[PDB]
DNA sequence: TTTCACTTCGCTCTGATTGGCTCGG
DNA sequence: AACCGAGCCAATCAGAGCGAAGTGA
């Protein structure tokens, strides 16, 4: 469900942002890249190896 | 007028609470002894989001400072607006659909039509 | 750069947490959604300020340009509330 | 020529990132 | 019954902050 008329103060900037996000989508593919399970290998391996309690928590 | 967006699309108790929250924000922003090194959001990351636009060249330190504060108020009022819908459905967990429902109440949020499709 | 197109999720999720009751939980789904909304909020307002700066042949986006852009785009409450905040920063 | 207002550099130090388990929904 | 998934914990290290140096109008 898409309306023809949105906020009159925002409509023109919305169109320009659609163009701007399309150009970033073409060059970086970021709009469709998706989310990695984790950002950093070093911080992942850290979290994996860390001493854990019986409840799966990081230890005191 | 200027403050129409505070209460726009809200009913009963929600109206009073969001109005009181905005009066709390206004009182804070009007206060005389700010520490401009204390923010919930990092200034460098706000500045990087701005610089994602190739039309943007140079940015005054003022702009990320205003956004740090503005973004806090935005996240807070939208989360509070979204919570209404979780309470309506007798849920203790906020879901994506609660934010989507909240956006539909005020035309202030029309700029997010593509970010949270209807 | 993929992490750089948003503000850190922990910072966004903390502000959401403080906005809700003590017993409330937030779906990962909702934290990611809010993260995307906030980044569009910055980019949407910045784009408006940026185009006016290019038209007036000014290289630097400043605080006053952000406030003007907020008013233009129908965030009048944000611009008016942050106006006092900018003037106190500049003194 | 110096000044102004930003960027980029270099570096220090800090707080965001991170997953196995529980148990309410 | 079976399944799903968000809070819980805190140490590393990516990067946020900051002074110095670089840039140019």
Numbering used by the authors:
A (entry chain A): 231 to 290
B (entry chain C): 47 to 164
C (entry chain B): 42 to 132
The authors write:
In addition to our previously determined An_CBC–cycA crystal structure, we also obtained data on the An_CBC in complex with the cccA DNA fragment (2.2 Å resolution). Superpositions of the Afu_CBC–cycA and the Afu_CBC–cccA complexes as well as the corresponding A. nidulans proteins indicated high structural similarity, suggesting that complex arrangement and DNA bending are uniform among these species and independent of the nucleic acid sequence and the target gene promoter site (root-mean-square deviation [rmsd] 0.153 Å for A. fumigatus, 0.246 Å for A. nidulans, 0.306 Å for cycA, and 0.369 Å for cccA complexes; Fig S2A). The primary sequences of Afu_CBC and An_CBC only differ by two Val to Ile replacements in subunit HapE. We, therefore, focused on the A. nidulans CBC.
